[PDB]
Amino acid sequence: NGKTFNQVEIKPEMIGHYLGEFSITYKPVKHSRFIPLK
Amino acid sequence: QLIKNGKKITAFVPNDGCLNFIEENDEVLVAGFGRKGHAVGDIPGVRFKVVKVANVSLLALYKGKKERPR
Amino acid sequence: ESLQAEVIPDPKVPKGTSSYQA
Amino acid sequence: YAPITFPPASVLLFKQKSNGMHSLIATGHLMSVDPDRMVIKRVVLSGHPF
Amino acid sequence: RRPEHGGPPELFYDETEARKYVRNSRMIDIQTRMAGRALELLYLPENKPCYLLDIGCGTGLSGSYLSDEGHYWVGLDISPAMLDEAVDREIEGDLLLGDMGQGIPFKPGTFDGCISISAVQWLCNANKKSENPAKRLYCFFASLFSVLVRGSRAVLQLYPENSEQLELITTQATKAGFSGGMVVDYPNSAKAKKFYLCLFSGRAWVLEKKERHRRQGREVRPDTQYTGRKRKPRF
RNA sequence: AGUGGAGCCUGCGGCUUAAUUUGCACCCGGCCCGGACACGGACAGGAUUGACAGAUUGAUAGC
Ligand SMILES: Nc1ncnc2c1ncn2[C@@H]1O[C@H](CSCC[C@H](N)C(=O)O)[C@@H](O)[C@H]1O
């Protein structure tokens, strides 16, 4: 995937898809008020 | 505190390196600062400078020419 | 008389899945 | 770490030689007796701005 | 350009304007959002059903927010059509068809807090000849100061068209007895420029000498890092 | 006439990231080579050069 290797089974229903779909190259994005006292 | 009259004065040391030769209860020879009884144009309210300590000059101690006893 | 106490007297992931893919 | 001594006191430092003689290395006065004085070891890391 | 510049607030906010007001999706969102910041900025007693005064309720948008928070309130409005559609929305708090500049008719020390969302910028423009902007603002602020329990904060969200507007509002408030300031949340941000008037009711010597000699016009050594530096200790 | 409202696209911030380059530059892995001078070591008992085949490797290769 650019950095590491991901191991995958080859299932019979995996027939129509590329190999690169099964190793995602990016990680998902996972992303206190003033009150005056005087 | 001066010996011959018991008066207290505040005396100047040429740098902080020379002050390490001075300890409490050392006999010190003191002169005036240099403008004839007037204080310093830089340090407010000091008129005296240390000349000798333990019968050796601060110039001889600061230049390694002589050592002082204790 | 003082005492000679110099010190204190008081005492779910598949096998081949990488950590990235996980 | 040393027993309390009230100043003034003179400070002689000696290093023991192999032949048994003590060689004099220092000279001075006992400044103070307090553990509140802290020593600060400093480490400098160096980097190259490539 | 501005709703305020149109003219008399009542004549501007007619039945047509009122219908379009509640139909506007932005109006709903921005007003509830501003009322949230208003109730937060004013430091109401925490975990306490408060008694606020809606100086500019209009459609009862800010009012409905206070009802949801459990804070009972009284509305005040110059637009009859807007108050009709506010009572058609069935808001919990009571309403009253009156003028802010004229004066709030409540016992001194009755409301613990006051919510005013976009309504005080209309008092700085004399729509009639008798209308006096300074006097109208002052009278309103003085009445509010008294009506409000001495100590409770009266948050006042405003939309100034210039500095003169803000200047007038602030002077007429500070001289009426209102103390505090103004919290401009997100001041640089323009779409979030929210002005809330929170108003509670209770070697250098050698350098100078060388410049002296330079102005006198004689030859002066060039100024370097060795200008004033002690050469040595002196014995 | 609009924009500021809504959906989409894009530019600066910010957030995630190995990198999301910057006022193919970025990231993850694998090759190639990198002084003489002085002094002290090993060196014809042998210093050192080239090499088939197999393998490691994402792949092959006396690198
Ligand atoms: N002098 C005055 N006296 C009373 N109400 C006034 C006034 N000048 C303006 N207003 C009111 O200011 C309002 C502007 S809109 C206020 C409603 C608020 N934005 C909300 O929806 O929560 C109008 O409803 C108008 O009646």
Side-chain angles (χ1 to χ4, degrees), chain A, chain B, chain C residues 1-11 13-22, chain D, chain E:
Chain A
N1 80 323
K3 192 178 180 181
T4 61
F5 291 91
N6 188 56
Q7 183 178 2
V8 65
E9 295 288 325
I10 301 299
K11 288 166 185 316
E13 68 275 16
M14 293 176 70
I15 192 66
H17 309 76
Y18 283 83
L19 273 183
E21 322 199 5
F22 305 102
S23 193
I24 310 171
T25 62
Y26 67 101
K27 281 184 176 180
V29 172
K30 288 168 76 173
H31 285 294
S32 183
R33 268 78 65 189
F34 172 79
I35 294 169
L37 274 297
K38 181 55 208 184
Chain B
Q1 178 182 22
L2 290 182
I3 280 170
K4 64 173 179 181
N5 44 33
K7 298 179 187 215
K8 322 291 180 66
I9 55 166
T10 309
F12 171 79
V13 189
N15 46 32
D16 305 60
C18 282
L19 188 153
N20 286 315
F21 301 110
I22 290 146
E23 188 88 344
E24 179 259 340
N25 307 321
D26 297 307
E27 183 178 1
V28 64
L29 176 72
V30 178
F33 210 67
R35 296 178 67 250
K36 278 87 68 172
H38 202 280
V40 192
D42 210 335
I43 299 91
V46 65
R47 298 177 290 170
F48 306 104
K49 63 171 182 188
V50 169
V51 175
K52 286 217 272 181
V53 58
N55 265 289
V56 295
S57 47
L58 283 193
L59 187 147
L61 289 165
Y62 173 84
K63 292 178 139 80
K65 286 169 175 293
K66 306 192 186 208
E67 65 183 1
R68 59 151 293 184
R70 286 188 98 253
Chain C
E1 173 182 47
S2 63
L3 188 153
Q4 64 182 357
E6 65 267 22
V7 188
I8 190 167
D10 176 85
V13 173
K15 186 139 162 295
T17 313
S18 88
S19 66
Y20 206 108
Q21 183 62 75
Chain D
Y1 289 124
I4 297 167
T5 296
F6 293 109
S10 180
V11 176
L12 283 186
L13 262 64
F14 291 92
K15 183 178 176 66
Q16 184 156 355
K17 279 179 71 170
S18 304
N19 48 6
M21 299 171 192
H22 301 347
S23 44
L24 175 74
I25 60 167
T27 296
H29 56 102
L30 175 54
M31 188 169 30
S32 54
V33 184
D34 49 351
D36 291 332
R37 198 175 188 275
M38 64 184 73
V39 193
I40 298 303
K41 192 158 182 166
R42 158 172 155 259
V43 178
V44 175
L45 313 159
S46 60
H48 293 236
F50 64 96
Chain E
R1 277 148 180 166
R2 283 289 185 115
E4 172 222 303
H5 288 164
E10 353 85 31
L11 249 196
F12 179 75
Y13 285 120
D14 67 301
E15 204 53 81
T16 304
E17 223 78 76
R19 254 108 242 243
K20 269 298 271 249
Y21 195 88
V22 282
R23 273 299 251 186
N24 184 23
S25 297
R26 179 66 179 192
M27 257 8 152
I28 312 290
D29 218 9
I30 197 57
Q31 252 90 245
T32 314
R33 252 123 40 138
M34 278 186 300
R37 197 45 177 130
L39 205 47
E40 190 172 35
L41 267 183
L42 114 94
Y43 211 28
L44 91 125
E46 292 97 88
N47 316 103
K48 177 252 186 158
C50 236
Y51 190 39
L52 316 139
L53 165 73
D54 231 308
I55 257 320
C57 49
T59 90
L61 250 163
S62 306
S64 260
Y65 174 69
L66 313 176
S67 302
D68 127 86
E69 303 274 287
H71 309 327
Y72 308 89
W73 54 276
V74 168
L76 215 116
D77 226 48
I78 211 39
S79 172
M82 231 117 142
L83 265 208
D84 297 330
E85 92 184 335
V87 93
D88 293 334
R89 237 174 99 188
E90 316 293 327
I91 48 201
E92 167 203 71
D94 217 345
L95 297 169
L96 187 74
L97 228 148
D99 195 271
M100 295 152 39
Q102 241 160 67
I104 305 111
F106 270 88
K107 266 152 234 220
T110 272
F111 287 108
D112 204 73
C114 155
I115 304 273
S116 168
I117 299 288
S118 55
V120 86
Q121 66 267 348
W122 299 83
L123 266 200
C124 334
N125 31 288
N127 312 109
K128 302 301 136 226
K129 277 320 200 64
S130 61
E131 256 183 75
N132 188 274
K135 250 128 261 155
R136 279 316 246 195
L137 276 160
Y138 198 81
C139 176
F140 155 68
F141 279 127
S143 189
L144 199 49
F145 164 72
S146 223
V147 163
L148 265 241
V149 176
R150 251 38 114 263
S152 59
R153 202 165 309 155
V155 54
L156 193 96
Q157 157 69 37
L158 71 133
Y159 276 118
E161 35 128 350
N162 38 48
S163 197
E164 318 279 344
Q165 267 223 339
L166 248 179
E167 169 237 80
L168 251 193
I169 293 163
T170 55
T171 353
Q172 306 311 290
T174 186
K175 293 159 127 294
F178 259 147
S179 184
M182 181 189 27
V183 188
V184 196
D185 285 297
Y186 272 83
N188 322 90
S189 282
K191 211 184 96 136
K193 224 153 32 86
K194 290 317 150 247
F195 302 76
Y196 295 91
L197 232 86
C198 269
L199 288 174
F200 50 81
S201 34
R203 187 186 202 278
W205 184 83
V206 188
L207 295 163
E208 291 179 78
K209 291 301 177 184
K210 289 182 80 172
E211 206 50 81
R212 177 66 59 83
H213 279 234
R214 269 167 203 134
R215 291 181 228 122
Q216 276 156 30
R218 56 152 84 190
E219 57 180 1
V220 177
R221 286 169 177 277
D223 201 74
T224 55
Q225 65 182 357
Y226 314 109
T227 300
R229 185 180 67 189
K230 189 164 77 174
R231 297 261 191 168
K232 56 212 148 178
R234 317 273 202 187
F235 299 95

